[PDB]
């Protein structure tokens, strides 16, 4: 028994990050197989961040202008291009210790674990969601950059984040594997725009079947609700609307605790309307959204990965 | 920026994990050297563990009743002894994966990494801190036990925690690695009394500096305070008196920020006497006692491990 905001373990990830160098920028790569991913960002000063043209200033680099290094050892680049907002960086030695993995574009209110690097060296593990506005919020310092987020299914690694950006207010942006920014957010030091955030309606309903599982029940009553009831009074708190889909996921908690998913919904109306009192849930004085159902059936069911 | 509760890269610790079976209980085991580590109840029916005479129940076990696993491989048992709550068992096969590592008796309100494993197999990583009565607040179930903690210093995993227990309260006690429980807990299925458990003073100090890094700083008031003053408002709060130590680890922190330790002081007195008003702090509506003042500087200052 137990809630915690569990990490995946980390082993297969720490043994593919690297350091990419290129001129006086250093950020950290991941090495797979034959190639080396990072942030393009690596080519630019601190003065072509401003307004960087990125086709212009790969041109000025050849393979030999990337210097990256794998703890000791330092590898061959023999190719590089730019893929989106990635650079990749062809080198000559697979990387040994590549685990099964596969590259994947996660969707807003999912969750992932970020290892946190710096100079090629791990740091950090912790669990992170994507906002509804496609921000994290992490822990980043300079050189965090090319830090990577991920999941583990039982032997398989599925990277779906790179760290790219610090907006001016604090919060964390970055792309998937393929390069691709998630939200609006470009790699140019410039004021940008992070939408309004909500939160994650069907995180929260699953951390309070995780209460409930682990004998937080007080926020029950045997009140009810239709979804377009609750939807127009989640909207009123800025809760993402609770789909069919949403609640069709929630479906093995509700089997397990015995707590209709529409119930759980009622309850957590009240808790909005009403507020908390004094009383927490879970040791959390706040709602918690970053757990997904999948997160609270796999940490309250014992899953394991290799 | 950005602030988040991590814990170190889990890698060299997976490394050291395996499945130790005696009869039909089945946890975890640390495998270092040519040493498997695990908790002595692994010979203990859920019979036994009401009343268990662990002498005479190893009396009856040899080294071929030992089971131990690591990936696919079972290792030769060729010797086995009890220190303490822990049983440990002789292999043949020195671990190749062995890190560099010491043994550590950590103090109350000191922080660990944990590593959850099921069947010799990680499941998750968290952080955690040991109370003042010497329980966790972790996340453990059936099969966790053996699930240790640790820290890293570089290259060196100091293990302080090995897991053994629920407590009929739903927190979770164990033991050092060589076998010795934190607190007054013991092996056996039995009602057994945790301290009052109180608020490490100096950790939420060390989190309020932190705030103040990531730019949270509503809570700073004009008053000071001594020593005393607070400490004699602490005791009334159920919090950990404070100690000219733990004055001088906030030395740095006190030195970045320009602010005076017991200026920070008087800010923490006024929280809790006038509580937080619905207000919140690095996120969070409560007062955060899990960071060390190590933590928040190696957090704030990115160290990196191999």
């Known amino acids: 028994s137990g809630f915690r905001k569990m990490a995946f373990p980390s082993g297969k990830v720490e043994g593919c990050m ?8 250093t950020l950290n790569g991941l090495w797979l197989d034959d190639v080396v991913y990072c942030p393009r960002h690596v080519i630019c000063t601190s003065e072509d961040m401003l307004n960087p043209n990125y086709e212009d200033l790969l041109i000025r680099k ?13 590898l061959r680049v023999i190719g590089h291009s730019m893929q989106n907002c990635v650079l990749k960086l062809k080198v000559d030695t697979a990387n040994p210790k590549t685990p099964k993995y596969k590259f994947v574009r996660i969707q807003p209110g999912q969750t992932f674990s970020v290892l946190a690097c710096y100079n090629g060296s791990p740091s950090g593990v912790y669990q992170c969601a994507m906002r ?8 980043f310092l300079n050189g965090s950059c090319g830090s990577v987020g991920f999941n583990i299914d039982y032997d398989c690694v599925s990277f779906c984040y790179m760290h790219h950006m610090e907006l001016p207010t604090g919060v964390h942006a970055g792309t998937d594997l393929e390069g691709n920014f998630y939200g609006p957010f470009v790699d140019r030091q410039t004021a940008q725009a992070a939408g309004t955030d909500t939160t994650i309606t069907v995180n929260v309903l699953a951390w309070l079947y995780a209460a409930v599982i682990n004998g937080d029940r007080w926020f029950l009553n045997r009140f009810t609700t239709t979804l377009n009831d609750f939807n127009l009074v989640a909207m009123k708190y800025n809760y993402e609307p609770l789909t069919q889909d949403h609640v069709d996921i929630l479906g093995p908690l509700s089997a397990q605790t015995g707590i209709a998913v529409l119930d759980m919904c009622a309850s957590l ?3 909005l309307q009403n507020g908390m009192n004094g009383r927490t849930i879970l040791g959390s004085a706040l709602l918690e959204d970053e757990f997904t159902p999948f997160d609270v059936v796999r940490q309250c069911s014992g ?3 290799q």
């Open 62 to 74: 050849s393979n030999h202008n990337f210097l990256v290094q794998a703890g000791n050892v330092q």
């Open 132 to 139: 509804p506005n496609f921000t994290i919020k992490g822990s």
């Open 269 to 271: 109306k009240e808790l």
């Open 303 to 305: 899953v394991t990965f």
């Open 18 to 25: 690297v350091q990419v160098t290129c001129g006086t920028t």
